[PDB]
Amino acid sequence: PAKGVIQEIIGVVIRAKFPEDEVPEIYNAIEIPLGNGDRLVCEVQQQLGNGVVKAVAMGSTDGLRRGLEVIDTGRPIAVPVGPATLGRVFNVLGDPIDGMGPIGPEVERRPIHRDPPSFEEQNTQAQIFETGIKVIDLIAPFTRGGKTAIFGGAGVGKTVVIQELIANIAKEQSGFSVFAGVGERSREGNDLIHEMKEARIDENTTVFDKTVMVFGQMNEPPGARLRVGLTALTMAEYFRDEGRDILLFIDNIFRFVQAGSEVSSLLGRMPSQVGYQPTLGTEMGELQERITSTKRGSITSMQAVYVPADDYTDPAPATVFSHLDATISLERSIAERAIFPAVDPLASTSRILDPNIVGEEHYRVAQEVKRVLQRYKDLKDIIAILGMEELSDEDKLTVQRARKIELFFSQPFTVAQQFTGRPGKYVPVKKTVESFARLLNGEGDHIPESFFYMQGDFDDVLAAYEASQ
Amino acid sequence: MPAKGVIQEIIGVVIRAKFPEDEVPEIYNAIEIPLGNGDRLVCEVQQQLGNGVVKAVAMGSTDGLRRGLEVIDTGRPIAVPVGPATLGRVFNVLGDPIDGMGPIGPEVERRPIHRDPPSFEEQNTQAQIFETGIKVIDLIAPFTRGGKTAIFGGAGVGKTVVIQELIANIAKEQSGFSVFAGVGERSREGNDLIHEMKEARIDENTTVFDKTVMVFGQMNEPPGARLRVGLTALTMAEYFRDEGRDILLFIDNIFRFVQAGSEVSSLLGRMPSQVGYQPTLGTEMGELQERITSTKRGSITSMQAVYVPADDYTDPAPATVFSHLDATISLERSIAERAIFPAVDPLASTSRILDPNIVGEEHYRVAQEVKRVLQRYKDLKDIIAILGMEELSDEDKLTVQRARKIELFFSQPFTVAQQFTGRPGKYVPVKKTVESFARLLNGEGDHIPESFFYMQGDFDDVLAAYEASQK
Amino acid sequence: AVDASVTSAIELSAEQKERITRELQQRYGDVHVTYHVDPTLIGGLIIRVGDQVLDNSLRARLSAIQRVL
Amino acid sequence: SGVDLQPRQVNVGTVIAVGDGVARLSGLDQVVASEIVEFPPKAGRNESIYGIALNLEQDSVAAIILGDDETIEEGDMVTSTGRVISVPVGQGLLGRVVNPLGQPIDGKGPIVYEKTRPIERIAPGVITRKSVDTPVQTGIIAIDALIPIGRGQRELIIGDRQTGKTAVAIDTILNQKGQGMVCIYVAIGQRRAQVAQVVGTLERFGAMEYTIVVSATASESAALQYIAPYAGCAMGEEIMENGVMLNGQLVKDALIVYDDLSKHAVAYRQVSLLLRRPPGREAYPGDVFYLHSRLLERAARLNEEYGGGSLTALPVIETQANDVSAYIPTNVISITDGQIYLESDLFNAGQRPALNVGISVSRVGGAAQTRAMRAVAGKLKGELAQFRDLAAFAQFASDLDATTKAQIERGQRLQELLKQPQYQPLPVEDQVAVLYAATNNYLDDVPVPLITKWRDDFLAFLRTAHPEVRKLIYDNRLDRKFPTPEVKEALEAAIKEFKATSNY
Amino acid sequence: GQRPALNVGISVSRVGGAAQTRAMRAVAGKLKGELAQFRDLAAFAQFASDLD
Amino acid sequence: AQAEQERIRMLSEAKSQIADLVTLTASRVLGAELQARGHDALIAESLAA
Amino acid sequence: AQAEQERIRMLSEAKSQIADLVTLTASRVLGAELQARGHDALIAESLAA
Ligand SMILES: Nc1ncnc2c1ncn2[C@@H]1O[C@H](COP(=O)(O)OP(=O)(O)OP(=O)(O)O)[C@@H](O)[C@H]1O
Ligand SMILES: Nc1ncnc2c1ncn2[C@@H]1O[C@H](COP(=O)(O)OP(=O)(O)O)[C@@H](O)[C@H]1O
Ligand SMILES: Nc1ncnc2c1ncn2[C@@H]1O[C@H](COP(=O)(O)OP(=O)(O)O)[C@@H](O)[C@H]1O
Ligand SMILES: [Mg+2]
Ligand SMILES: [Mg+2]
Ligand SMILES: [Mg+2]
């Protein structure tokens, strides 16, 4: 239907002319036959004039000429939704890539471009979501049905924290999970995430058996990375709308943003700030507002956000920051100091860090830990050149407690046994609060700092110190 | 009506209008767009693009305009009224009275906004000190007659209050008139808090408002209005300069003028300069400042407030004005928070006229010695922060006491500061303030404690307060 | 002229077509007129002269969703 | 059905290019520079999507679309309705969450109204306004004592990404319960869940009896976010000019809070760049200062001739890495009559309101305070300034002398006094009583890490043992000589009695 | 003089630890642990036999 | 109180859906009338404009 | 339960849904003629459900 002709091919952007009365819609999908029986499913973005449209390739577009025919499908990119998508690995277009057979035509296909839930649908109910990580469960607690993100640089442990979260919480879900590997690098993803999700057993069913996986990896051209997040959100919204709880892990939202930036550069838009698209905020709103949990069902989102260089003032993470219920900041300085759960407690916040929601003692302990660390950060310049000896006795005690707290936030992970030769350790939120309260009370002042490195609760530190004696 | 064209394009506050090829408006001409309410929108031409098309800055909302609207060229630049009719009135960039009073009649003289500055041979090199009512301004950074003087500080340091206090002082205790240029004027600072504060009686029935002219290029105005309001006030003051009178001009802010120029240049599609600023920054600043000179006939003497964000004096707005100044008054927030509301820093407040050959030898000696003792105190206060003053001092006690007394004595209650405090204002002549600081510098004030120097006039007021307490 | 169009809901024969074009003597006599069948108008007429449209269609009279909607 | 023969010759154009929410409308002559273009319903579409004809180029109208542009196709007809953007105003907007077009989004039903005010208008004028005299009691002791906000004042709340700007704004809105003020909270670019949480917080404390919410969420078009603050500003103008009945009294005082003008500027930059307008600094359009000022000069305090009403603006700006020298932060700092600086370093150090009093400025000053607060705040400001000066010798220099140690310790007590928990505003009588206790050396014995607790327990004392003292203080908070012997007694007596009965 | 200037503190291998000869990993776990101990004691290598 | 507000919201939604469900009560009737009562040549005379 | 009563009330066509729509169509389409040259069969078949 509505057969047009390719006019221009600039990168992954294809400008195609169509008849005047049969111009494709704004987000319509158009297929280039490409020969060999396999199509290239471009997605329209703009209408330029007398049947002239601009589309994003969603594919290689590296060996196709001008003048090729383009068949307008008349509908946007439709991906399968339902129980048939559980235990399968999909593309940006919803085509399975695993060895299993294709999705049958009887399965409902939904467009990847849907309106976000309205204001009446929003669910503000918040409660603690225990993760087993001390720094996450204390400083920036997770919200069940709330949006949390793990910002970080390049060498910091973003994928390791995502893997540990999956290993800790995906065995007990009371629902389903969706993993959007947007620019995930395809080695630490399906080569590893899918392998470890088929090894974890939940009542004789693997975690992967109740997990949708959609992978717009780094090798893909910008269009696949630009729409794969929306594909995964469309697949998760079906389970959300029917009441099932959803655990959504989107890895490197910044890859989504970067793909959008490259497409906008090829689309001729005028750039903003450091080469970014003018429509950065609206694109971020379009993806992020569909992630929100509603009254029918809840999505507990855990996104990873790459930070270019180490610049947290970059427009992409800055736009991500305001779309979250919990923020975790990973710092290269902490990671280089071998505190590998390198969460910055002063730069990590959470909305449910309230004495009414999480508890009075939890709130008091977290705020006192942050206050001690802020005092340490203020005295860093004093300690750097004068040394510890010039500080007052209270300041010396505060700095020692802060160093012990910094070392104590480090925790051995089950998925990190190859790096640190220690077994994985799970610490409940109550044990985390009690251990940090005991550390702040004065217990452990006689213990040297090195016994707080890569331990569980305070009882593990005490046991190690008594073993050393 | 020399020419009538049609609007071709409306892009924000930029109007492209097509005129007949033999009747194209000039570069700085004013073009009126008649609206369907009996009023008009006056745009200023900026460029002549091709065959009969001119680009103009709106100086108005342009939310009622459509393409093809009639545009009447005025033939000449914006004409603003001049003369006694403008005295005691409040105007805008177009010269239209924005107060509640009636419109200016057609019998008054109207002068174009854009005028060449006085030539080189008309410059009066004779430097003369202009008497301000402020102790620290008189002593540390004296006000030059016919010169351009600036005030630098952060937010809320007291620049606008100081400017209106000089307006009140030089209109009450002196016969000098004043013209005010509210460039980017806040509608709270300009529409109130200066009109009411200029309702201060001069002798019996004339207020400071009746002897001053005000031109408010408000903040909600488009960038062209805020760009040309300074030139409007200059045109209004140049009539009083040409009458032989020594006129006073207060530009309430300079960096807003620079911001308006930058916005106008960005909207016109000019190539950006430096950090996104206008390429004609120096030329625009020179065009504004070079009309404020002392001539043989009269003299425009100006004070211009400049707000430095944080402590950045290298920003284009204060950097482009430094070349045009004869004196700088550096306001500090630290001094303001110490209840010294005229928060002038005696250090880092320079003046070209502070020379013994101009202000006299006694003035120069007193100012230099006051700066020296304050500089010594700048280190001695640190020294006494840990080692108490009574512990050890080789004349350090005396110089610390004198420096504290003089830095409190720099504080002066303002006439316009009665709302903030309630203390009645004080005016000190330039002779009395230097005499008082000379008297306080060497003895004669060592017995009076540092509480009677807080808000006083000359040293006689400090004495009268002391022997009023000891009754 | 070139943009002049007449659009009803029912299909038109030559008689009412020329009757409609006769009415356009108000603008340019026998104006160059194009007709479109457009059965979704639910009665009425749409007259586009230059860049102006008179929307006499009953769908426009019902203003799409009723004022109560 | 009410049609007057329908003879209107509406001007029409055709969409020749629709892109990222921007449509080129081809020949649409005699269109005003900010009209609403209709985009009438077509095949497969039963609704009209309105747009703002911003860019009137030659033989081309570029209009930004207030909604989804996916259903707008090339060749679609558009009609230039003569109306500019207007929003419903009046009593019926109270307690309703609406979009910038005025349509309700809380699902509670249609908005009952009879007046529509245009979102764009000139500021009230020059002779129209009056000096700011009546305070806006935010309930935060630091703001109400050191950076006061008055009715008709534009007070910027500027800070980092998570420092308490929305918390300060919400606490200020909550404190205006019986103060006879209508609050408006414009959410620009905020996520819809955050707006829902804010509305839930306002409903929990009953603040929605007098609050209007005008939210343009991040998923909505940049055209909606662009007109997001101007709508709501129209409602505040109607409240300050015509008045609105509230608790049996005609309130003409409004408090509008633009929760993100940084996001508003981002949306306007997106609009301008999609319209291919020339960029300025940081890719922002040239008229981005003219934008916010046009929004912020409409917050006035009219004199008794024009009604006596007032509109108070509380802009909120988010800085990146505390860079207040950026383009939009400098613009809004220049426009506003005062700034509230919030620091994450102070926020993490226990200073929960995170007020950076050293650089925060209120240009209105004492005129925006009650006379009791003016009496009890001058010494507080001076002592805090002295503490900020000689706080360098407080980390490791411990000997000093008696005077420096006393000044440091008094500053520490006063700073600990300013810490406040969230959603716990203090009445003005409580604040002036606490500040009188602190500034008259009545707290010199109670140690620092109890001061806040002391304050709370003191207020509890004044709420149980001596309510008549609070009533007496509140009754004569406006006299020039506030510490009268009637009020100085039974307050010093109350402080002494509380210090005697409570061990501290 | 450490010509193969491997920064053992920050140089990592996300994979390939399992792709190692068991002999090499068996004899290199102790090497990595003791190099970590040496790096920990590097800050304490400024005392005149105060730690022994 | 929130439950009462939600009940009022549901009443308003029912009132709006009364008109939304009146789409078939009016559109089909108008179409049938235009097919029968309007018939042909029901274009009146646009003499005003 | 309250909305069920409103839905049942709106389910009746001629009671509160067909009469008002027919009157509005008569007033708008033509010169206030409920039937005019038709609409007799569509009076009861307006909803067609
Ligand atoms: N006085 C306070 N005491 C305790 N917590 C506070 C206080 N003020 C703010 N917070 C904390 O701040 C968070 C609420 O968001 P906040 O008001 O800081 O947003 P913001 O600074 O406007 O920025 P954004 O909306 O971009 O995150 C919660 O975690 C809340 O606990
Ligand atoms: N919890 C941890 N324990 C030990 N090492 C870790 C941990 N987290 C991260 N690392 C180190 O970080 C590297 C993995 O970083 P990764 O998270 O993949 O970076 P990215 O942010 O690009 O995903 C590994 O080589 C590992 O040495
Ligand atoms: N002479 C003065 N006496 C008392 N207060 C003053 C004085 N000058 C300035 N202030 C304080 O400064 C504020 C006005 O500052 P303003 O001059 O408008 O700031 P800026 O210097 O940025 O224009 C007033 O609220 C007042 O409290
Ligand atoms: Mg990764
Ligand atoms: Mg000022
Ligand atoms: Mg916020």
Side-chain angles (χ1 to χ4, degrees), chain D residues 246-259:
Chain D
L246 196 144
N247 279 1
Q249 66 180 359
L250 187 82
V251 166
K252 300 182 86 160
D253 290 348
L255 177 63
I256 182 150
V257 176
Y258 317 104
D259 199 83

PDB file of all heavy atoms in Angstrom, chain D residues 246-259:
ATOM      1  N   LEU D 246     -13.200  32.915  49.523  1.00  0.00           N
ATOM      2  CA  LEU D 246     -12.414  31.878  50.177  1.00  0.00           C
ATOM      3  C   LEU D 246     -12.637  32.004  51.674  1.00  0.00           C
ATOM      4  O   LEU D 246     -12.342  33.055  52.252  1.00  0.00           O
ATOM      5  CB  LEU D 246     -10.934  32.027  49.832  1.00  0.00           C
ATOM      6  CG  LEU D 246      -9.992  30.855  50.090  1.00  0.00           C
ATOM      7  CD1 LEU D 246      -8.961  30.820  48.992  1.00  0.00           C
ATOM      8  CD2 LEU D 246      -9.319  30.990  51.442  1.00  0.00           C
ATOM      9  N   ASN D 247     -13.178  30.947  52.285  1.00  0.00           N
ATOM     10  CA  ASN D 247     -13.458  30.907  53.722  1.00  0.00           C
ATOM     11  C   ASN D 247     -14.324  32.081  54.169  1.00  0.00           C
ATOM     12  O   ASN D 247     -14.211  32.554  55.302  1.00  0.00           O
ATOM     13  CB  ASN D 247     -12.164  30.855  54.540  1.00  0.00           C
ATOM     14  CG  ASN D 247     -11.587  29.458  54.629  1.00  0.00           C
ATOM     15  OD1 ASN D 247     -12.135  28.511  54.064  1.00  0.00           O
ATOM     16  ND2 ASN D 247     -10.475  29.320  55.341  1.00  0.00           N
ATOM     17  N   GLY D 248     -15.192  32.561  53.283  1.00  0.00           N
ATOM     18  CA  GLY D 248     -16.067  33.668  53.601  1.00  0.00           C
ATOM     19  C   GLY D 248     -15.474  35.049  53.433  1.00  0.00           C
ATOM     20  O   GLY D 248     -16.113  36.025  53.837  1.00  0.00           O
ATOM     21  N   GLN D 249     -14.279  35.172  52.857  1.00  0.00           N
ATOM     22  CA  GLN D 249     -13.681  36.476  52.615  1.00  0.00           C
ATOM     23  C   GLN D 249     -13.178  36.555  51.181  1.00  0.00           C
ATOM     24  O   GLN D 249     -12.793  35.550  50.585  1.00  0.00           O
ATOM     25  CB  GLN D 249     -12.537  36.769  53.598  1.00  0.00           C
ATOM     26  CG  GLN D 249     -11.322  35.875  53.441  1.00  0.00           C
ATOM     27  CD  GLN D 249     -10.225  36.211  54.429  1.00  0.00           C
ATOM     28  OE1 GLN D 249     -10.358  37.132  55.234  1.00  0.00           O
ATOM     29  NE2 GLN D 249      -9.131  35.461  54.374  1.00  0.00           N
ATOM     30  N   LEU D 250     -13.197  37.764  50.626  1.00  0.00           N
ATOM     31  CA  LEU D 250     -12.782  37.981  49.243  1.00  0.00           C
ATOM     32  C   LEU D 250     -11.266  38.109  49.201  1.00  0.00           C
ATOM     33  O   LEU D 250     -10.714  39.182  49.449  1.00  0.00           O
ATOM     34  CB  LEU D 250     -13.456  39.218  48.664  1.00  0.00           C
ATOM     35  CG  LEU D 250     -13.225  39.448  47.172  1.00  0.00           C
ATOM     36  CD1 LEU D 250     -14.173  38.594  46.348  1.00  0.00           C
ATOM     37  CD2 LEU D 250     -13.386  40.917  46.826  1.00  0.00           C
ATOM     38  N   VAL D 251     -10.589  37.011  48.886  1.00  0.00           N
ATOM     39  CA  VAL D 251      -9.134  37.008  48.797  1.00  0.00           C
ATOM     40  C   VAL D 251      -8.719  37.569  47.446  1.00  0.00           C
ATOM     41  O   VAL D 251      -9.215  37.137  46.398  1.00  0.00           O
ATOM     42  CB  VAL D 251      -8.585  35.589  49.000  1.00  0.00           C
ATOM     43  CG1 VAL D 251      -7.137  35.517  48.565  1.00  0.00           C
ATOM     44  CG2 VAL D 251      -8.734  35.170  50.449  1.00  0.00           C
ATOM     45  N   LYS D 252      -7.814  38.549  47.469  1.00  0.00           N
ATOM     46  CA  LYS D 252      -7.217  39.100  46.260  1.00  0.00           C
ATOM     47  C   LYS D 252      -5.704  38.926  46.248  1.00  0.00           C
ATOM     48  O   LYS D 252      -5.005  39.658  45.546  1.00  0.00           O
ATOM     49  CB  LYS D 252      -7.585  40.576  46.104  1.00  0.00           C
ATOM     50  CG  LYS D 252      -9.076  40.833  46.011  1.00  0.00           C
ATOM     51  CD  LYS D 252      -9.371  42.308  45.816  1.00  0.00           C
ATOM     52  CE  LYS D 252      -9.313  42.688  44.349  1.00  0.00           C
ATOM     53  NZ  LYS D 252     -10.046  43.952  44.076  1.00  0.00           N
ATOM     54  N   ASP D 253      -5.182  37.974  47.017  1.00  0.00           N
ATOM     55  CA  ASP D 253      -3.752  37.721  47.104  1.00  0.00           C
ATOM     56  C   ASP D 253      -3.456  36.337  46.551  1.00  0.00           C
ATOM     57  O   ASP D 253      -4.107  35.360  46.935  1.00  0.00           O
ATOM     58  CB  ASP D 253      -3.263  37.830  48.548  1.00  0.00           C
ATOM     59  CG  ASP D 253      -3.286  39.252  49.062  1.00  0.00           C
ATOM     60  OD1 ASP D 253      -3.451  40.177  48.241  1.00  0.00           O
ATOM     61  OD2 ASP D 253      -3.145  39.445  50.286  1.00  0.00           O
ATOM     62  N   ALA D 254      -2.473  36.254  45.659  1.00  0.00           N
ATOM     63  CA  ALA D 254      -2.117  35.002  45.015  1.00  0.00           C
ATOM     64  C   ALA D 254      -0.623  34.747  45.148  1.00  0.00           C
ATOM     65  O   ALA D 254       0.183  35.678  45.223  1.00  0.00           O
ATOM     66  CB  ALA D 254      -2.518  34.998  43.539  1.00  0.00           C
ATOM     67  N   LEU D 255      -0.271  33.465  45.181  1.00  0.00           N
ATOM     68  CA  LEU D 255       1.108  33.001  45.297  1.00  0.00           C
ATOM     69  C   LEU D 255       1.344  31.946  44.230  1.00  0.00           C
ATOM     70  O   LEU D 255       0.903  30.806  44.385  1.00  0.00           O
ATOM     71  CB  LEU D 255       1.379  32.421  46.683  1.00  0.00           C
ATOM     72  CG  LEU D 255       2.762  31.827  46.952  1.00  0.00           C
ATOM     73  CD1 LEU D 255       3.850  32.867  46.848  1.00  0.00           C
ATOM     74  CD2 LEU D 255       2.781  31.170  48.315  1.00  0.00           C
ATOM     75  N   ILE D 256       2.045  32.306  43.162  1.00  0.00           N
ATOM     76  CA  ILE D 256       2.275  31.398  42.046  1.00  0.00           C
ATOM     77  C   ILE D 256       3.695  30.861  42.130  1.00  0.00           C
ATOM     78  O   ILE D 256       4.644  31.608  42.394  1.00  0.00           O
ATOM     79  CB  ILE D 256       1.997  32.075  40.689  1.00  0.00           C
ATOM     80  CG1 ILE D 256       2.202  31.078  39.554  1.00  0.00           C
ATOM     81  CG2 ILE D 256       2.858  33.312  40.494  1.00  0.00           C
ATOM     82  CD1 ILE D 256       1.341  31.348  38.369  1.00  0.00           C
ATOM     83  N   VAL D 257       3.832  29.553  41.942  1.00  0.00           N
ATOM     84  CA  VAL D 257       5.103  28.855  42.062  1.00  0.00           C
ATOM     85  C   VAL D 257       5.365  28.137  40.750  1.00  0.00           C
ATOM     86  O   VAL D 257       4.713  27.131  40.448  1.00  0.00           O
ATOM     87  CB  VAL D 257       5.104  27.860  43.228  1.00  0.00           C
ATOM     88  CG1 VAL D 257       6.404  27.089  43.247  1.00  0.00           C
ATOM     89  CG2 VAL D 257       4.875  28.577  44.545  1.00  0.00           C
ATOM     90  N   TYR D 258       6.320  28.640  39.971  1.00  0.00           N
ATOM     91  CA  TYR D 258       6.774  27.964  38.759  1.00  0.00           C
ATOM     92  C   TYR D 258       7.857  26.979  39.173  1.00  0.00           C
ATOM     93  O   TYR D 258       8.999  27.367  39.425  1.00  0.00           O
ATOM     94  CB  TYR D 258       7.294  28.968  37.739  1.00  0.00           C
ATOM     95  CG  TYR D 258       6.435  30.198  37.602  1.00  0.00           C
ATOM     96  CD1 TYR D 258       6.819  31.402  38.169  1.00  0.00           C
ATOM     97  CD2 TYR D 258       5.240  30.155  36.906  1.00  0.00           C
ATOM     98  CE1 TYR D 258       6.036  32.528  38.044  1.00  0.00           C
ATOM     99  CE2 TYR D 258       4.455  31.274  36.774  1.00  0.00           C
ATOM    100  CZ  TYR D 258       4.855  32.457  37.346  1.00  0.00           C
ATOM    101  OH  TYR D 258       4.070  33.577  37.217  1.00  0.00           O
ATOM    102  N   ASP D 259       7.501  25.694  39.240  1.00  0.00           N
ATOM    103  CA  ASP D 259       8.389  24.720  39.864  1.00  0.00           C
ATOM    104  C   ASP D 259       9.632  24.428  39.035  1.00  0.00           C
ATOM    105  O   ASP D 259      10.588  23.864  39.572  1.00  0.00           O
ATOM    106  CB  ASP D 259       7.646  23.418  40.144  1.00  0.00           C
ATOM    107  CG  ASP D 259       8.360  22.560  41.167  1.00  0.00           C
ATOM    108  OD1 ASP D 259       8.176  22.797  42.378  1.00  0.00           O
ATOM    109  OD2 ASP D 259       9.114  21.653  40.761  1.00  0.00           O
TER     110      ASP D 259
END
